């Protein structure tokens, strides 16, 4: 009988049948269904008339168990008295020279707080005085604390019965076994005697004796228990830069992350930062001790960095150690991040040396280019180390992989003006076996910023510029480099002139030059020619033209702050990007009211009518997620009765299988057919079924990507920002206004709220809400807001829209 | 308003479109800072060649509305519209031109702030030919 | 047609619909039998009551039960509240077809497959009566609303109409002592097979299935297997008054009458329903909704809805009107056609309904509209939207077709359609579909006018002409032209003050409440729709926004009146009560009480001698008196109610006087309260409640820094003692420099144990001996010369004033 | 007490037999052992799992769950050790774990539950010392 709540009357006729199995097998059911909490008092009578006196374990023991867990609830059979039906003849159970039954009975009649059986137990120490086994003697301390605890703080549960009445702790301690059941409240004289004890101890017992006192002057001195209470010692004489080397907490920490990767990744961690303790800057972090493993000795045999080369990874081992080894490696050495990033870059990045870290998919190649490059607009050193590693990648030389390489020098050179003089020659190389845009954007634009270094230009340009493959974006980069650097610094058959024409050409004109551009006609809609067609004032000569623009960098490039830059090594980015970091007639009337923070619906019941309207009760009902805090409890509802009936409110639970609507509320009456009527109090809406929950701009961005957010709808009385009206409005259908989506100037200044919910519906809940409060001559619709909503069905979509309009609800009785 | 849609999945050429329109009309039949806020977010999880868009769309933006510049300073800063890849390079001398120099050239450059090209109307042959197939 | 329930249950041989409430019961041949709610959408019961089929199903609705018979060849009843077979018996040997519940005594009558009807008593041990006639299955029984007489449809090729407290039927020629029943041919020819025939019906059509009626008819109509029903008198048993009904293909099972329109609506075994001419008895339609063959029909006797029962499972199907237009004079509710005929007036909680004479609609209603002055309304019949049909106008207060043909009063006259319009007896017509406009030429106007005509907008209803066809448009009194349009949002409803010069249209919060034209005089508070709510023609607005009748406003008061049972439409307001309908159509009345208006009118004229009285408990709620009355910055409201105390705290913080806070905060059971009215006290000007207060937060420290400021010294050094033991080093430390002498600090310090800063202290002062002793019983070296003094003089002239400012003068206001 | 309540679960949904040493978790112990131990105990196969923060230490056993829950604790090998003695004494009754045999022992179950965790403390058990009380 697993759960079957009714059963109790076939339980009544097993319960005594001359069959012994059969009285045992439904006691036994009985207690099963009340563990589960189900029908129990019918049967009483016949539990308790079999087993009472009687040395036979088995259904003793039945009965003792059912004494536990409801004898206080069960009245049939037993009633209410001193000496119950519990414990009258179980005062045998008590005094039998069985153990067992003597020893179970104690258990029991103890463990109760119960003042009807306050007396019986208090004498049914006895049963356990005697310790015929190590669970006898602790059966009997923690049966004695169990009487103290049970209204005998004073002398009834105190000193000795004939040997324990709260001096089987004193005794444990000196005896075999031990078990202290003195944790708190309890003699002194034991809590001393577990002292001594420490040393003669028994080991689970040291357990007990141990949650009472701690702290050891000595090493140990032996068991599990006391190994247990000493890492946490040891932790004390020592907190100073973590443990660093973690003590006797190694053990349990492995098991915390079974789940199988997570463990090494953590274990490489503490490794790591256990190493040394350097500078600490941006991704420089490694705590711990400064000397305890050192870093680097030069007579170190086979020394530290054997360890330091596993946390630099291109995935070496598996992607959650590789995402935790490429940080520790950039943590332990660098400079910042910079060095070692620039190590790890590139063996990364693509190469003609190893086609085990190169790729012919061009993003990825291109990304691993950028983030080595970064390096070096971070920190000077690395410029120097970047650019003959960008020419080996380079070298490659099919049509995308140079075309990769170019497109971040390019960048390189804007920050780094006529340093990278050199690399121009190399650059050209693979310019000629083309299929992309990429290697002609890339290439036209080191070739023409570097002009005055090389003179190749007419040769190089024009076997691309009569080839094909794809050319959009080739025009605009194209387009604003040709020419640039020095006037007349260059000669093939076509000078840097000829360039300037041909730049002119590919930009949007039309020259012989170069055997024509191959395509004129620009990238993007808005790009065109013309700028730079205006433009070479002084024909490609740094001065204030393409050569000023390509010889300098648009705004602040520096660091890894993404300015020319890319934050560390490609693929460890991937990861971090992912983590979000989420954080019968009746009238009612009826008002809210707050008294002492107490949130109550106000509800009179009337009775207008003569007629009879007994039988009348007032239930408040948990319809959804709304719920009674306690109904109104009067019994009211009377003839020409006017009473105040008070019924508490929350608004958070668990959906119920009744209806979900606004507010149920039920009285009760006279009446057969409608005994129960449900009338109404005033207005809840299906709103507050909505959960709250919050985004940030990485959750609401990632969310606006996975599910459309098109729908719109503008909302007067939106006029006001975001924290007024709004904010309020939006918190009743439980939504919040948090982190921004704008872009504020003198031209711009929406207001922009990104908003989130996880809506007990479904779905989550999002909007933006955008108020149009004018910063332009030429505003929206002027002061409101358009609200631009989304659900992920968007189905609470809809309920954002309209409640962040108004919302106010009041009466005065 | 269809750029409300869908915040990078709705492609490149949307936000190029209400990009190249915004940029281009100047709109005082709406603010333009909606449009602004809108095409800002799209940039930063969309391909190259509507960043780079964005910033000489700006630019030119700059040069037919004087009012608009404080707006092309703010986005332009930003690792997005400037200093990623190509859209560093027109970036650079977009803004050069802009923020340093005559705007003789930026003025020039804006006719309308229209297209690359005006071909014929396209779509409708294509489409013909296209749905009973 | 419209689906209201489809439930798919696999073959259902009976069906019965609820004379009470508006269930449905289905027996199915899959054995079971279930009870719906087919509004609701619950499921009642389910109960498995034989293995076979269950042919037979009925409501027991004398005390709330349901009957079924099934093939177990029983009647059973049963409970849909318990779950419980509250009686069984034998109703025959063979399948119970049809069982049907006499409402004389709790007797069950049973038809059965057997050949007779039989009708037993339970109550009793007696079988009052056996009811036999049939040669062949009584396949069906039904009740009309009288309990004296039945019909049973038999395949013997009759119908048999019995008595159910008659043995049989009960019949006595008076012109004759002899049996009604010949076996001889007399002037018709059947056998001997009755005690006595009442009336012996036709039914042939090779047997009929069944037979049921229209609930206001004697007329009854049966299907038979064939494929013809025949409609038939079971009053006279006239065979000069049956006509047939021909379009079904295969065996009839069952056509009963449609309650609610002019139509007979039959199902066959096909695979098709048929729905036939009511006044032609031929085939109009046939519908194939392809669930196969139909065993079973139903027609409300509630006049509900309508429902047959198909071979998947049953439909209950709607065709029925929503949302009627509606207007309230002095008692009178005149609505647009709806279900169970013409009903209003009385009640106010209950969903029964009753009715009075104020039928606005007593014909097809084109147009139902008031008088604006409410003295005459305007139906419009014989349907139309051509140019012409007729209009009949009834007396408002009572109401006929014609009052009297032979008086100025209830005329009728063509007119596509009439509409009454301001100048409170005029009204404004289509009559050639064009807006004409009439005058009858004083009193209000009955007869037809043809000058003036437009050529925008198209007849309909209204109350002051609408017509659409892209907007609701209102129209001039003797002008063609176009007075007004509105367009906005509604919830299917048009709502008028009580005069049909003014309109209400409901707007995205509440609905508003406007003049003749578009002008909005105002708007209702409250955050949702209504979905009615009326103005007594201004000023008392009572509205419905759910279950319960609520004032939005009278006289600047705010009340919810009181709760009815059912949700349900304000009808209007016109007098003290509001009379409301819902979308069936049973009324609720309500008298606007003086409980909630008069509180409040009294409380905005500053009574509260008044208020006391007015305090009941069909209005106390728990603010809006006791704790809204607590809402006055210059306490008056508050003065009077201050029994929380919260509330208490509140009103003197309000007044500035902290005496009564003090007391409350008290009473909060709490510090915070103490410490921020002690802040509002010396902001009263004087520093003892001050004291008083900050010493119970315990903040003896701010009282430290407050005395010298204050200017006590004794209270002073109160403080120093009781901050010195909680070393508060910015409280104790005070005192010392704010007396003129340091030596508080010196011993206060020592106690510290910072020497140091005591001997610094006390040695600038002069007194170097307690510096000194300071020195000796710590580290000396008292010589150092600090960026402080050490040894210069300290001395301060202690406060000046003789009476101090716990002593702060006041006389308050 | 600092263990609210032994038990044993099945993960069909509900708590197949429990013990309350102390009347407190009646019917709350079923709620708790149905939803958590369904999941794992919400665990990834590591015997300390805590959830609606209770602590949760478990073994599976078939789709069976043996259950410890605290929510409070006083040392680390001690809720162990009662779970371990627990699982010794647990085979002896019921022969592995299985709901309908676990049912039909109940009292077997539950008698040990008492005995082995006495108002929430951690007593020991054998299957020698469990005889006596079933004798």
């Given at each position: 009988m697993d759960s079957e709540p009714p059963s109790e009357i076939s339980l009544k006729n097993d319960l005594e049948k001359g069959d012994v199995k059969s009285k045992t097998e439904a006691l036994k059911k009985v207690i099963i269904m009340i563990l589960n909490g189900e029908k129990l008092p019918g049967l009483l009578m016949t539990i308790i008339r079999f087993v009472l006196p009687l040395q036979d374990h088995t259904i003793k023991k039945l009965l003792l168990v059912f004494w536990e867990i409801v004898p206080k609830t069960t009245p049939d059979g037993r009633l209410l008295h001193e000496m119950i039906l519990v414990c009258d003849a179980y005062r045998k159970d008590l005094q039998h020279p069985n153990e067992f039954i003597r020893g179970s009975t104690l258990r029991f009649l103890c463990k109760l707080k119960e003042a009807e059986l306050l007396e019986p137990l208090m004498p049914a120490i006895r049963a356990c005085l005697e310790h015929r086994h190590s669970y006898v003697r602790r059966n009997a301390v923690l049966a004695i604390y169990t009487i103290y605890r049970n209204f005998e703080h004073l002398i009834p549960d105190a000193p000795e019965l004939i040997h324990d009445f709260l001096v089987n702790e004193k005794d444990a301690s000196c005896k075999r076994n031990a078990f202290m059941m003195l944790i708190h409240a309890d003699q002194d004289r034991a809590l001393d005697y577990l002292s001594t004890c420490?040393?003669?101890?028994?080991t689970f017992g040291d357990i007990l004796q141990l949650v009472i006192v701690e702290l050891i002057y000595k090493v140990c001195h032996a068991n599990p228990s006391e190994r247990a209470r000493f890492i946490r010692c040891i932790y004390n004489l020592l907190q100073s830069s973590s443990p660093a080397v973690k003590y006797e907490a190694a053990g349990t920490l492995v098991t915390l992350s079974s789940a199988p990767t997570a463990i090494k990744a953590a274990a490489q961690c503490y490794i790591d930062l256990i190493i040394k303790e350097s500078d600490n800057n941006v991704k420089l972090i490694v705590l711990d001790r400064l000397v305890e493993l050192k870093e680097h000795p030069a007579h170190e045999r086979v020394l530290q960095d054997l360890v330091m080369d596993i946390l630099r990874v291109l995935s070496t081992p598996d992607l959650e150690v590789r995402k935790k080894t490429l940080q520790l490696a950039l943590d332990l050495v660098s400079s910042r991040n910079v060095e070692e990033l620039v190590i790890v870059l590139k063996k990364e990045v693509i190469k003609t040396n190893n086609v085990s870290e190169h790729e012919d998919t061009d993003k990825y190649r291109q990304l691993l280019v950028r983030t080595l490059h970064s390096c070096s607009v971070r920190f000077p050193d690395m410029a120097a180390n970047v650019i003959p590693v960008l020419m080996e990648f380079l070298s490659d030389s099919n049509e995308a992989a140079a075309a990769d390489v170019l497109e971040f020098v390019r960048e390189a050179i804007q920050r780094f003006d006529n340093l990278r003089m050199l690399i121009v020659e190399k650059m050209l190389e693979v310019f000629h076996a083309i299929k992309s845009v990429k290697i002609y954007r890339g290439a036209l634009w080191i070739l023409g910023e570097y002009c005055s270094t090389k003179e190749d230009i007419q040769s190089v340009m024009t076997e691309v510029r009569r080839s094909l493959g794809e050319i959009p974006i080739v025009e605009s980069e194209i387009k604003k480099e040709a020419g640039e650097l020095k006037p007349e610094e260059e000669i093939t058959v076509g000078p840097v002139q000829k360039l300037v024409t041909e730049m002119g050409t590919y930009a949007t004109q039309s020259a012989l030059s170069s055997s024509r551009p191959t395509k004129k006609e620009e990238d993007r809609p808005p790009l065109r020619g013309f700028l730079l067609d205006g433009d070479f004032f002084v024909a490609a000569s740094l001065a204030t033209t393409l050569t000023k623009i390509a010889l300098r960098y648009v705004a602040l490039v520096q660091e890894k702050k993404k300015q020319n830059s890319f934050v560390a090594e490609a693929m460890l980015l991937m990861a971090t990007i992912l983590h979000l970091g989420k954080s019968d007639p009746v009238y009612a009337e009826a008002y809210v009211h707050v008294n002492q923070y107490d949130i109550v619906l106000d509800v009179l019941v009337v009775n207008q009518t003569s007629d009879t309207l007994q039988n009348c009760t007032l239930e408040l009902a948990t319809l959804g997620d709304l719920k009674l805090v306690e109904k109104p409890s009067p019994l009211t509802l009377a003839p020409h009765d006017f009473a105040n009936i008070k019924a508490n409110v929350k608004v958070a639970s668990t959906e119920n299988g009744i209806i979900f609507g606004n507010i149920v509320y039920d009285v009760s009456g006279a009446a057969s057919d409608r005994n129960c009527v449900v009338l109404s109090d005033i207005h809840i809406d299906i709103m507050d079924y909505i959960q709250p929950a919050t985004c940030t701009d990485a959750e609401f961005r990632q969310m606006w990507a996975e599910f459309e957010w098109e729908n719109k709808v503008t909302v007067n009385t939106n006029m006001t920002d975001l924290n007024d009206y709004l904010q309020h409005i939006l918190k009743s259908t439980n939504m919040k206004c948090l982190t921004p989506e704008k872009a504020l100037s003198g031209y711009c200044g929406f207001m922009a709220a990104n908003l989130y919910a996880r809506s007990i519906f479904g779905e989550d809940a999002l909007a933006n809400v955008s108020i149009e409060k004018p910063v332009h001559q030429g505003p929206d619709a002027a002061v409101t807001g358009h609200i631009r909503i989304r659900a992920k069905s968007q189905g609470m979509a809809l309920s954002l829209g309209d409640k962040i309009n108004l919302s106010q609800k009041k009466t005065s009785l | 308003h269809l750029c409300e849609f869908i915040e990078d999945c709705e492609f490149t050429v949307l936000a190029t479109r209400i990009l190249h329109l915004l940029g281009q009309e100047g709109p005082k039949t709406n603010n333009p800072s909606k449009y602004i806020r809108f095409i800002y977010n799209r940039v930063v999880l969309e391909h190259e060649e509507v960043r780079a868009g964005a910033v000489s769309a700006l630019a030119k933006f700059g040069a037919q509305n004087e009012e608009m510049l404080p707006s092309i300073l703010v986005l332009l800063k930003r690792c997005v519209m400037d200093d990623d890849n190509e859209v560093r390079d027109r970036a650079t001398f977009y803004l050069n031109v802009l923020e340093q120099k005559q705007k003789a050239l930026n003025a020039g450059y804006i006719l309308n702030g229209l297209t690359v090209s005006i071909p014929g109307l396209e779509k409708a042959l294509q489409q013909y030919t296209l749905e009973p197939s | 047609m419209l689906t209201k329930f489809e439930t798919k249950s696999a073959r259902v041989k009976g069906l019965s619909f609820h004379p009470k409430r508006p269930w449905i019961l289905t027996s199915l041949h899959n054995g079971v039998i279930q009870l719906w709610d087919y509004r609701m959408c619950t499921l009642i019961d389910k109960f498995d009551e034989h293995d076979g089929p269950v042919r037979g199903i009925d409501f027991h609705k004398q005390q709330p039960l349901f009957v079924s018979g099934g093939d177990d060849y029983k009647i059973k009843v049963w409970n849909y509240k318990l779950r419980r077979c509250l009686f069984t018996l034998l109703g025959h040997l063979d399948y119970i077809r049809t069982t049907f519940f006499h409402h004389e005594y709790p007797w069950i009558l049973s038809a059965s497959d057997d050949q007779t009807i039989r009708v037993w008593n339970w109550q009793s041990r007696t079988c009052v009566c056996v009811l036999t006639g049939h040669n062949h299955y009584v396949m069906c029984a039904q009740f009309h609303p009288s309990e004296d007489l039945v019909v049973s449809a038999s395949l013997d090729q009759t119908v048999r109409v019995w008595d159910i407290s008659g043995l049989r039927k009960k019949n006595l020629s008076p012109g004759a002592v002899e049996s009604d029943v010949r076996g001889i041919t007399g002037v018709d020819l059947f056998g001997t097979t009755d005690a006595v025939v009442k009336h012996v019906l036709e039914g042939h059509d090779r047997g009929v299935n069944w037979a049921a009626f229209?609930?206001?008819?004697p007329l009854i109509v049966s299907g038979a297997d064939d494929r013809q029903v025949k409609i038939w008198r079971?009053?006279?048993?006239?065979?000069?008054?049956v006509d047939t009904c021909r379009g079904h293909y295969n065996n009839v099972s069952c056509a009963v009458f449609h309650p609610r329109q002019e139509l007979i609506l039959s199902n066959s075994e096909d695979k098709s329903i048929r729905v036939w001419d009511m006044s032609k008895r031929t085939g109009v339609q046939t519908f194939r909704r392809d669930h196969d063959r139909f065993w079973v029909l139903a027609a409300h006797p509630n006049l509900n809805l309508f429902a047959a029962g198909h071979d998947g499972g049953m439909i209950v199907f709607k065709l029925e009107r929503e949302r009627p237009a509606y207007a309230v004079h002095g008692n009178m509710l005149h609505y647009v056609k709806d279900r169970f005929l013409r009903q209003l007036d009385f009640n106010s909680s209950k969903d029964v309904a009753v009715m009075q004479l104020r039928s606005g609609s007593k014909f097809p209603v084109f147009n139902m509209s008031y008088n604006p002055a409410e003295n005459a309304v305007l139906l419009c019949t014989r349907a139309s939207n051509l140019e012409n049909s007729t209009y009949d106008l009834y007396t408002i207060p009572k109401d006929a077709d014609s009052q009297n043909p032979d008086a100025p009063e209830g005329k009728r006259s063509s007119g596509l359609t009439a509409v009454w319009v301001a100048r409170n007896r005029f009204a404004v017509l289509d009559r050639m579909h064009s807006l004409l406009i009439k005058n009858l030429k004083n009193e209000i106007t009955k007869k037809i006018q043809v000058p003036n005509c437009d050529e925008i907008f198209y007849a309909g209803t209204g109350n002051l002409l609408l017509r659409d066809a892209d907007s609701i448009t209102l129209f001039d009194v003797q002008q063609k032209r176009t007075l007004a349009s509105v367009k906005i949002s509604k919830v299917k409803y048009v709502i008028w003050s009580a005069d049909m010069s003014h309109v209400a249209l409901l707007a995205k919060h509440a609905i508003v409440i406007c003049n003749r034209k578009l002008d909005a005089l105002c708007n209702i508070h409250e955050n949702i729709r209504v979905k009615s709510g009326a103005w007594d023609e201004s000023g008392v607005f009572i509205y419905t926004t759910s279950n319960h009748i609520k004032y939005a406003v009278t006289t600047g008061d705010h009340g919810i009146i009181r709760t009815l049972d059912l949700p349900i439409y304000v009808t209007r307001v016109k007098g003290n009560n509001v009379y409301c309908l819902d979308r069936e159509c049973r009324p609720r009345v309500l008298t606007i009480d003086p409980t909630e208006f008069k509180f409040k009118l009294a409380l905005i004229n500053r009574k509260y001698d008044e208020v006391l009285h007015m305090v009941r408990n069909a209005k106390l709620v728990g603010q809006s008196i006791i704790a809204y009355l607590q809402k006055k910055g210059y306490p008056e409201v508050a003065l009077h109610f201050v029994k929380d105390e919260k509330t208490r705290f509140s009103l003197a913080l309000e007044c500035g006087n902290i005496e009564i806070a003090l007391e409350a905060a008290k009473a909060l059971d709490d510090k915070n309260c103490w410490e921020k009215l002690g802040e509002v006290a010396l902001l009263q000007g004087n520093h003892q409640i001050v004291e008083m207060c900050y010493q119970r937060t315990k903040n003896f420290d701010k009282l430290s820094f407050l005395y010298l400021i204050t200017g006590n010294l004794e209270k002073l050094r109160k403080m120093m003692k009781i901050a010195e033991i909680r070393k508060d080093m910015s409280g104790h430390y005070q005192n010392a420099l704010y007396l003129g002498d340091v030596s508080e600090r010196v011993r206060i310090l020592k106690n510290c144990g910072q020497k140091s800063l005591a001997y610094l202290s006390a040695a600038t002062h002069g007194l170097d001996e307690e510096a000194e002793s300071l020195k000796e019983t710590f580290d000396p070296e008292k010589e150092t010369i600090p960026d402080i003094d050490p040894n210069a003089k300290l001395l301060q002239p202690p406060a000046?004033?003789?009476?101090l400012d716990t002593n702060w003068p006041l006389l308050t206001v | 007490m600092v263990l609210l309540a032994a038990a044993v679960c099945t993960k069909a949904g509900k708590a197949i037999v429990s013990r309350q040493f102390v009347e407190m978790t009646r019917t709350r112990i079923e709620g708790l052992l149905a939803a958590f131990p369904k999941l794992m105990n919400t665990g990834k196969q590591h015997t300390f799992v805590e959830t609606e923060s209770v602590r949760y230490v478990y073994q599976p056993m078939e789709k069976l769950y043996m259950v410890l829950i605290t929510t409070k604790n006083s040392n680390i090998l001690e809720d162990l050790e009662t779970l371990r003695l627990f699982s010794r004494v647990i085979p002896e009754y019921c022969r592995a774990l299985e709901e309908n045999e676990i049912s039909e022992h109940c009292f077997d179950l539950i008698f040990a539950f008492d005995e082995i965790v006495a108002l929430g403390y951690r007593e020991n058990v054998n299957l020698a010392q469990i005889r006596t009380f079933t004798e």
């Open positions: 420490i040393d003669q101890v028994q | - | 229209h609930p206001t008819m079971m009053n006279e048993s006239k065979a000069w008054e000046p004033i003789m009476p | -």
